[PDB]
Design a protein around this ligand. Structure first.
Ligand SMILES: O=C(COc1ccc(F)cc1)c1ccc(O)c(O)c1O
Ligand SMILES: O=C(COc1ccc(F)cc1)c1ccc(O)c(O)c1O
Ligand SMILES: O=C(COc1ccc(F)cc1)c1ccc(O)c(O)c1O
Ligand SMILES: [Mn+2]
Ligand SMILES: [Mn+2]
Length: 181
């Protein structure tokens, strides 16, 4: 069977705003999407999941991810000043105005409990909430609190399955999956 190009896949199957933000992110961190095309796909996937999570309840969440870094920190600092939330040590992905906390979103094909533990060990807050999605449909979240309802989460998971399925039909999945870390 033909083995497609990952860059072609990303440009065809992700919305143009997502793709532009992903390109800008990669440039900001000094990386060529032409040699790190699996990473380009992972950044787009993660960004899309952040946007879908926010869209599940419009205006409940401020989006942090996808902004250039200096701008992201000014937003985080503003939120902390306004709401009195504790300032995080690493940029998180969202702020939840309802539960009054920052959220870190993970997207993985590794074992979700291990990935969760590595995230929690990395960020070292008892405040920031972590929500992990696997392409298997599995998920794991801080204190078994999943934040959104089952159908919002099912929409995210279905999008992940769709990405996985389209990658596989293009021969792109095996390499993408192996590229993690
Ligand atoms: O981190 C990644 C890929 O991240 C993923 C994250 C979740 C997945 F299911 C698959 C891949 C990555 C891929 C290619 C590369 O060159 C690189 O430097 C990366 O960090
Ligand atoms: O793309 C990301 C996060 O944003 C990034 C932004 C720039 C990079 F060089 C690397 C990652 C990503 C984050 C968590 C995750 O679980 C995942 O699969 C990701 O692709
Ligand atoms: O952006 C990164 C890695 O690069 C960073 C750059 C600055 C930070 F304060 C934190 C991370 C990142 C990796 C995994 C992930 O899930 C995520 O949301 C990220 O932003
Ligand atoms: Mn992030
Ligand atoms: Mn994240």
């Amino acid at each position: 069977g033909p083995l497609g190009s990952m860059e072609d896949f990303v440009r065809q199957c992700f919305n143009p705003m997502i793709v532009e933000l992903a390109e800008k992110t990669m440039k900001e961190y000094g990386e060529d999407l032409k040699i790190e095309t699996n990473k380009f796909a992972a950044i787009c996937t993660h960004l899309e999941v952040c946007f879908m999570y926010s869209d599940a309840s419009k205006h409940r969440f401020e989006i942090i991810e996808g902004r250039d870094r200096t701008m992201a920190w000014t937003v985080v600092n503003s939120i902390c000043n306004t709401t009195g939330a504790e300032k995080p040590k690493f940029l998180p992905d969202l702020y939840d105005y309802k539960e009054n906390r920052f959220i870190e979103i993970g997207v993985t094909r590794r074992e979700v409990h291990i990935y969760y533990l590595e995230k929690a060990n990395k960020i070292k807050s008892e405040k920031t909430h972590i929500h992990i999605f696997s392409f298997t449909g599995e998920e794991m979240a801080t204190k078994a609190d999943y934040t959104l309802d089952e159908e919002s989460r099912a929409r995210i998971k279905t999008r992940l399955f769709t990405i996985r399925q389209e990658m596989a039909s293009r021969g792109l999945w095996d390499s993408f999956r192996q590229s993690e870390r």
